Design an enzyme around this catalytic site. Structure first.
Site, short mmCIF file in Angstrom:
data_model
loop_
_atom_site.label_atom_id
_atom_site.label_comp_id
_atom_site.label_asym_id
_atom_site.label_seq_id
_atom_site.Cartn_x
_atom_site.Cartn_y
_atom_site.Cartn_z
N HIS A 41 0.81 -1.19 0.00
CA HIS A 41 0.00 0.00 0.00
C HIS A 41 0.87 1.27 0.00
O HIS A 41 0.37 2.35 -0.37
CB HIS A 41 -1.02 0.01 1.14
CG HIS A 41 -0.50 0.36 2.49
ND1 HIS A 41 -0.16 -0.55 3.45
CD2 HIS A 41 -0.29 1.60 3.02
CE1 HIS A 41 0.23 0.12 4.53
NE2 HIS A 41 0.16 1.41 4.30
N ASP A 84 0.06 -7.67 1.68
CA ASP A 84 0.49 -6.28 1.59
C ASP A 84 2.01 -6.15 1.60
O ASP A 84 2.60 -5.55 2.50
CB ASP A 84 -0.14 -5.49 2.74
CG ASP A 84 0.01 -3.98 2.63
OD1 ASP A 84 0.38 -3.49 1.56
OD2 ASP A 84 -0.29 -3.30 3.66
N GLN A 177 0.70 5.54 11.46
CA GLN A 177 0.85 6.12 10.18
C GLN A 177 2.28 6.71 10.00
O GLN A 177 2.87 7.36 10.85
CB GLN A 177 -0.18 7.17 9.90
CG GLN A 177 -1.56 6.59 9.47
CD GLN A 177 -2.22 5.61 10.46
OE1 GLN A 177 -2.51 5.97 11.63
NE2 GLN A 177 -2.44 4.35 10.16
N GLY A 178 2.80 6.35 8.92
CA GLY A 178 4.16 6.64 8.53
C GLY A 178 5.12 5.52 8.83
O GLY A 178 6.24 5.54 8.31
N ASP A 179 4.72 4.54 9.65
CA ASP A 179 5.53 3.36 9.90
C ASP A 179 5.30 2.25 8.88
O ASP A 179 6.03 1.27 8.86
CB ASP A 179 5.25 2.79 11.30
CG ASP A 179 5.71 3.76 12.40
OD1 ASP A 179 6.80 4.35 12.26
OD2 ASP A 179 4.95 3.86 13.40
N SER A 180 4.24 2.37 8.07
CA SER A 180 3.90 1.30 7.14
C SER A 180 5.12 0.92 6.30
O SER A 180 5.91 1.74 5.88
CB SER A 180 2.77 1.68 6.21
OG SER A 180 1.55 1.73 6.88
#
Length: 224
Positions: A41, A84, A177-180
């Protein structure tokens, strides 16, 4: 990362930051000189030229070695949150040495055991919806949550055999969020997953959900 502490130099020799449009975006893991593993993603369908990888640094914006992307390949069964993972090929080869190294991967067919201690790292927010993010890499340790408990939290269909979960019931420790796309490792520093999704961040009784390296080795091995 919520509830984290600063990573030390060399804690994750393979971790990369993935900037997009010059700003924070994702993390990833350097598999070899030419290849990064991240979450699908983070990259699927976006302009490839917007991404910049940096290896060998605790910061996203200086230090270490950078590369643009040559190609992006998502898992052939990526759908919704399922499967993912993506393989990125780098325009500039990055040599190991010093604080750069390549990841070792969870065995094919392995599945993290509930209660075992995992560590996740990244440059993401420190609260759900936070706007500010840390300059230097944070990490946090959380136990694996059984797939059965995770399916109680999210629903049966929502958690597949290519996902595993980690977190504490009380919340307060999680990826955000931002660690994905960045790494989650076992206690040996073997790469067991990539940060994928969850209900908010660090909420009570909603585990972080991770794309499982052990379940997805055929794709990784074929294209790395």
């Amino acid at each position: 990362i919520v509830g984290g502490t600063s990573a030390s130099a060399g804690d994750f020799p393979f971790i990369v930051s993935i900037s997009r449009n010059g700003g924070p975006w994702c993390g990833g893991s350097l598999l070899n000189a030419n290849t990064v593993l991240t979450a699908a993603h983070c990259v699927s369908g976006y302009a490839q030229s917007g991404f910049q990888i940096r290896a060998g640094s605790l910061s996203r914006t200086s230090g270490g070695i950078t590369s643009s992307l040559s190609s992006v390949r998502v898992h052939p069964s990526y759908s919704g949150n399922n499967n993912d993972l993506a393989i990125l090929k780098l325009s500039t080869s990055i040599p190991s040495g010093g604080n750069i190294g390549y990841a070792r991967l969870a065995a094919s067919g392995s599945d993290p055991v509930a209660g075992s201690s995992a560590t996740v790292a990244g440059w993401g927010a420190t609260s759900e919806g936070g706007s500010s993010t840390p300059v230097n890499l944070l990490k946090v340790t959380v136990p694996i949550v059984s797939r059965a408990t995770c399916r109680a939290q999210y629903g049966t269909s929502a958690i597949t055999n290519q996902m595993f979960c980690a977190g504490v019931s009380s919340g307060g420790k999680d990826s955000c969020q931002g660690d994905s796309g960045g790494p989650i490792v076992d206690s040996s520093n073997t790469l067991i997953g990539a940060v994928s999704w969850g209900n908010g961040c660090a909420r009570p009784n909603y585990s972080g959900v991770y794309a499982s390296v052990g379940a997805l080795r055929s794709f990784i091995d074929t294209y790395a």
